[PDB]
Amino acid sequence: DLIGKVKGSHSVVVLGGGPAGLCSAFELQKAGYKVTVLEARTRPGGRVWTARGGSEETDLSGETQKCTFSEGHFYNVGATRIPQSHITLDYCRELGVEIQGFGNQNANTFVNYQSDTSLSGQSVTYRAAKADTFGYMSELLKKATDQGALDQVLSREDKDALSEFLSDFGDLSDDGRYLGSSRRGYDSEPGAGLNFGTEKKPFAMQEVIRSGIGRNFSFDFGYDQAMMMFTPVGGMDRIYYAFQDRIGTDNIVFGAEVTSMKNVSEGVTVEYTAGGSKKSITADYAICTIPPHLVGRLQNNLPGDVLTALKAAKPSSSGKLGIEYSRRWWETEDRIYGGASNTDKDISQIMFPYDHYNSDRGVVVAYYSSGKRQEAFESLTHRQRLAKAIAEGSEIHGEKYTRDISSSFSGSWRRTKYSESAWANWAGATPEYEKLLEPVDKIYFAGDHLSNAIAWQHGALTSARDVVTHIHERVAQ
Amino acid sequence: DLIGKVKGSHSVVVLGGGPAGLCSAFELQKAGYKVTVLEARTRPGGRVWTARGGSEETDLSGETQKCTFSEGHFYNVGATRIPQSHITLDYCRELGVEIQFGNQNANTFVNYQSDTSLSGQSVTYRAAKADTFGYMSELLKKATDQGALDQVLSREDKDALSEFLSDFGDLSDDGRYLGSSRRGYDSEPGAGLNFGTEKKPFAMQEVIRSGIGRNFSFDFGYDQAMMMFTPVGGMDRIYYAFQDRIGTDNIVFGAEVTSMKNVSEGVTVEYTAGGSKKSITADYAICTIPPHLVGRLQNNLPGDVLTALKAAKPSSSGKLGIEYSRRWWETEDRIYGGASNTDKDISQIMFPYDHYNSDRGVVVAYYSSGKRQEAFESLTHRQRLAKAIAEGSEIHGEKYTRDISSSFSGSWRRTKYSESAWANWAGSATPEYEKLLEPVDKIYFAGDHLSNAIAWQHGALTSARDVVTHIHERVAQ
Ligand SMILES: Cc1cc2nc3c(=O)[nH]c(=O)nc-3n(C[C@H](O)[C@H](O)[C@H](O)COP(=O)(O)OP(=O)(O)OC[C@H]3O[C@@H](n4cnc5c(N)ncnc54)[C@H](O)[C@@H]3O)c2cc1C
Ligand SMILES: Cc1cc2nc3c(=O)[nH]c(=O)nc-3n(C[C@H](O)[C@H](O)[C@H](O)COP(=O)(O)OP(=O)(O)OC[C@H]3O[C@@H](n4cnc5c(N)ncnc54)[C@H](O)[C@@H]3O)c2cc1C
């Protein structure tokens, strides 16, 4: 248990029913607090948003998209993957939300980059790119070792042990050269009898180095990205519908746009508009999970230095676009089941689905880009986003990328009402971050921006748990 | 698709209802042949065997094991994982067999003996990789900066390589490996000022001499690289699906073949079923019985064919599953699927890819081959279990010994109607392999041993398809 049972009558109003708000309400309710969550949207989960057939969104440009994905088909417009260390998985267990493997690494997906080489704009599988990169890297280090370049730092035994590893890791010849590998894959698959197949031949060392084909390999090592990774079966939002059901819809007001938040003699008073009607609620404490750039728009009595600190959390651009195909060509032709292709093009990456394997249709994430390469889509209409996504995807996966398209749906977080950012990028552990960990009398801030895991649910959930613990200790005092 | 309808009446007898035999029968039927499969066991699938509650097996030593795993819990005693290029996935699609396999995991352990302080110490894959690639990258950058590779790299190549090594190894600005977040954390980063605490790096010489990177290249195997897949509920679901499409009226289970002879009208096969000596004659035969077992049959095969069969030498491999009543690997070690790897006889410990976050699970406590399976072969199941738990506790601690519900083991060189895990051709195509691709009048051999994917279902399936195609083309003239 996070906290013991609270003694007596104590109330909290939670602004925002995203992960931080719902986790806060869930934990406070467990401990016997009166809790009310106010959520502006008509769904729980905030930046955890899963697009399905029937999903409708009007963005800040006034464009309305209606998703028409087939029944059971979806994609996560925000949060989609979870590493093994994150408390998100603990909450999936607590809430009974089934998880499955998320394909965050795949030998068969492509890399495709521009360079001053003949590989420029050429798709190469990860396994081929890795085999060549690690083949030549191993050959070079073995050559230096054999030449005696590392004799001041390696003993004879160290050199022998290193050489053995390099021959294995690089699949080197008996004489220490990278000459290609079955690890690159096959143009024709090995079968039965005298059907030996045909190994894909290697690129030259100079091509490999000058193409930068290994620029994305270290992504595999990210603490929060390395396999194994996980995701909820049927969409990430299922975590937050599960929180909703545990909290009870009697304790959550949806379509409740908070317009004011003030410390008052009785506690904290929050005004909000719901169903076009003006409402007010007072509680002993408030947990404010509204994104920090949006908090200043509220009528408030926050001190100037708090308002200034909130502005240090700069908004960030990020967006996704999903295309439903009526043929799973990536599985049938490319032998790609999940994972992502990676590119320097604006689309940045193409993410293949982790469910309905071998089915008749599926949703591909045609782009998931951030920063400059999302600013390239942000101001386009959805139709224009789609056209650009298809063109760039076809340059990676061929003309099949353009065929068998059923429908599509995009989100761009900086243009999305009640988000206006994918995640915070603090100016400059900063003084503004540290300032916003302190309560403003009876108002506490929580969210992924006030964590060391920004842009992870873990950050939101651990922030909620810390803030609930602080309120509980204060009530005890 | 494979073949397009046969004209008139034609019959085939298939010896063995493993993957090659069932695939053969399935495709022949689709083309309009009369087919009868003779299978010695009471289950379809052969070396594709899934142990669940109720499984009973008596091995060639006379020991009977009775599996008592909880409903819905199982493990694959033989085939368990499938790469994306294999036709096994295409048959899963055709048969409606749902797929979901963790073949790489940053959080599982490596544990090897060495003349270092890491000897017999468990190290996570992510820590072992970060240190290995960190120091490897530092050393290659050092050699490059020194000028050791000036005769093979240009100035611009050196700069491009240095950039890659900095990021691949997570080197400091001055080119040293000093640790990384990639190693993981002793305390997880959370919210506020809860930064967590990184795990500190091992020293260079220790890392090199420990051999903790000796298994990293497994990640790159053409048939092992992620993404990998497996059928939901067990690998044997593929072969129960074949069984149901073929029809149990066309399969005689508990049918021990004792004779196979070319005769005037085709091939006559004698077998014992229901205690009775039976005979069947068909136009053609497809013999999928493992090659070392074929010689035991009464037959009229030419001497050179009998000699060729003996060149396919049998091999030792086996597995042992333990059902735990607590998923400690998930709750304590944050391991969700994947395998720990070791030089101990157990060889590896494979964690389950289903029932994530649930209350119980089956761990494959060993999967070993060759000498390291010969260490288990002659042991009783009780002795196998004791050895598995002893060696496993040396890797995963005392928790490995607790919450044990039940267990079940297979050793393929002691298993009736297998007596081998897979073949190794002496001289490894070899002349004996080539010889056995030829029909012996109306008798065709098929199986994974007559493929370039031995010890894969793909090998058995492509062998079946090739043999069915040969028969069809011969029937067509
Ligand atoms: C593109 C993208 C990719 C991501 N990738 C991952 C990933 O793969 N895995 C992962 O774990 N996380 C990922 N995340 C991060 C994850 O979505 C966030 O960490 C999490 O949603 C943060 O929760 P929060 O409660 O702090 O904020 P939010 O989710 O933003 O919730 C804030 C809530 O406040 C509400 N609100 C705003 N204004 C008002 C108002 N005036 N009145 C009432 N309510 C209001 C909003 O509607 C919203 O529901 C991703 C996010 C994005 C957008
Ligand atoms: C330990 C182990 C691990 C494996 N790992 C993988 C993996 O992860 N993925 C993968 O794809 N493959 C794997 N395989 C390989 C896979 O199991 C085989 O490739 C496949 O089972 C071979 O099919 P087959 O039809 O050639 O032979 P078998 O499966 O051996 O079938 C032969 C059949 O002949 C029958 N038979 C024998 N004698 C008689 C007789 N006298 N009369 C009647 N019938 C008889 C047997 O009962 C059996 O059903 C593994 C196998 C083992 C044992």
PDB file of C-alpha atoms in Angstrom, chain B residues 1-12 25-35 283-284 468-477:
ATOM      1  CA  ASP B   1      -1.536 -23.115 -54.566  1.00  0.00           C
ATOM      2  CA  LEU B   2       1.305 -25.643 -54.237  1.00  0.00           C
ATOM      3  CA  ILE B   3      -0.305 -27.962 -56.806  1.00  0.00           C
ATOM      4  CA  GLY B   4      -3.504 -27.664 -58.884  1.00  0.00           C
ATOM      5  CA  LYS B   5      -5.883 -30.653 -58.653  1.00  0.00           C
ATOM      6  CA  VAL B   6      -4.889 -34.198 -59.687  1.00  0.00           C
ATOM      7  CA  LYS B   7      -6.790 -36.094 -62.394  1.00  0.00           C
ATOM      8  CA  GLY B   8      -8.236 -39.511 -61.509  1.00  0.00           C
ATOM      9  CA  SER B   9      -7.630 -41.773 -58.514  1.00  0.00           C
ATOM     10  CA  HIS B  10      -4.222 -41.758 -56.820  1.00  0.00           C
ATOM     11  CA  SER B  11      -3.191 -42.786 -53.300  1.00  0.00           C
ATOM     12  CA  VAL B  12      -0.330 -42.021 -50.927  1.00  0.00           C
ATOM     13  CA  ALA B  25      -1.036 -35.274 -46.260  1.00  0.00           C
ATOM     14  CA  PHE B  26      -2.614 -31.811 -46.053  1.00  0.00           C
ATOM     15  CA  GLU B  27      -1.269 -30.718 -49.445  1.00  0.00           C
ATOM     16  CA  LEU B  28      -1.965 -34.045 -51.164  1.00  0.00           C
ATOM     17  CA  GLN B  29      -5.576 -33.962 -49.990  1.00  0.00           C
ATOM     18  CA  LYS B  30      -6.034 -30.413 -51.245  1.00  0.00           C
ATOM     19  CA  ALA B  31      -4.930 -31.664 -54.657  1.00  0.00           C
ATOM     20  CA  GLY B  32      -7.446 -34.556 -54.596  1.00  0.00           C
ATOM     21  CA  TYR B  33      -5.277 -37.517 -53.552  1.00  0.00           C
ATOM     22  CA  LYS B  34      -6.387 -40.305 -51.241  1.00  0.00           C
ATOM     23  CA  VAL B  35      -3.996 -40.136 -48.280  1.00  0.00           C
ATOM     24  CA  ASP B 283       0.563 -45.860 -55.168  1.00  0.00           C
ATOM     25  CA  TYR B 284       3.327 -43.899 -53.419  1.00  0.00           C
ATOM     26  CA  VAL B 468       4.498 -33.634 -52.809  1.00  0.00           C
ATOM     27  CA  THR B 469       5.443 -31.528 -55.836  1.00  0.00           C
ATOM     28  CA  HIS B 470       7.673 -34.309 -57.172  1.00  0.00           C
ATOM     29  CA  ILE B 471       4.932 -36.911 -56.747  1.00  0.00           C
ATOM     30  CA  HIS B 472       2.371 -34.653 -58.419  1.00  0.00           C
ATOM     31  CA  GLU B 473       4.643 -33.920 -61.397  1.00  0.00           C
ATOM     32  CA  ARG B 474       5.287 -37.639 -61.775  1.00  0.00           C
ATOM     33  CA  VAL B 475       1.580 -38.488 -61.630  1.00  0.00           C
ATOM     34  CA  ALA B 476       0.953 -35.747 -64.242  1.00  0.00           C
ATOM     35  CA  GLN B 477       3.670 -37.167 -66.546  1.00  0.00           C
TER      36      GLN B 477
END
